[PDB]
Amino acid sequence: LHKEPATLIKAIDGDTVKAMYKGQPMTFRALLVDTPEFNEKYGPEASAFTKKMVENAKKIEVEFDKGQRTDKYGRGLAYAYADGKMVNEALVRQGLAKVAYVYKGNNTHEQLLRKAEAQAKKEKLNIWS
Ligand SMILES: Cc1cn([C@H]2C[C@H](OP(=O)(O)O)[C@@H](COP(=O)(O)O)O2)c(=O)[nH]c1=O
Ligand SMILES: [Ca+2]
């Protein structure tokens, strides 16, 4: 896979961010994770985690997988990186997202993220507490 440039427009919630990609605004939905909705327990925490991460980064980057690049809502499906650190992985390692929506053909980082989730569950963090 390859990392491509993007510029943060707004953090939206734990697993969606709006960003400028190839010069057009795009809402990105993080591959392979599911944060709680803002109205649910750990929703506000997930939202603040991802917001801090992307807003504090000197750059963000998006990396598409091998399969679908857009979902049925028009959202970009990507792994997002904040100064080289993957947001998707970080959320799962902190117990603020579950590994989810793992579709054949769009699951390059599945094992990386399942390992993180095992660690968060072992440490009883957030969702897992
Ligand atoms: C993460 C992801 C979500 N989606 C779709 C499936 C779900 O459809 P449904 O809306 O019909 O439930 C929805 C979940 O996103 P949210 O968790 O942002 O609600 O997004 C994909 O199609 N591919 C993906 O890789
Ligand atoms: Ca969600």
- Residue 4 CA, ligand 1 centroid: distance in Å: 22
Query: What are the residues whose beta carbons fall under 8 Å from the beta carbon of 119, sequence distance 6 or more?
Result: 93
User: What residue has token string 């095992």?
Assistant: 118
Cα-to-chain-centroid distance, residue 14: 7
Total number of domains in the chain:
1
- Domain enclosing residue 87, as ranges: 1-129
CA separation for the pair 35, 24 (Å, rounded): 25
Way the structure was solved: X-ray
Ligand nearest to the CA of 17: 1
Contact 123/95 with Cβ under 8 angstroms?
A: yes
Q: What is the resolution of this structure in A?
A: 1.6
SS3 of 87-100: the string is: HHHHHHHCCCCEEC
Cα-to-chain-centroid distance, residue 12: 11
Burial classification of residue 100, based on how many CB atoms lie within 10 Å of its CB (0-12 exposed, 13-18 middle, 19 or more buried): middle
- 15: closest CA among 40, 39, 44, 47? 47
Atom of ligand 1 nearest to the CA of 71: 22
Handedness of CA 21, 8, 89, 34 (dihedral sign): negative
Amino acid at 30: A
CATH of the domain at 9: 2.40.50.90
- Residue 35 CA, ligand 1 centroid: distance in Å: 11
DSSP letters spanning 28-86: EEETTEEPPPTTSTTHHHHHHHHHHHHHH-S-EEEEE-SS-SB-TTS-EEEEEEETTEE
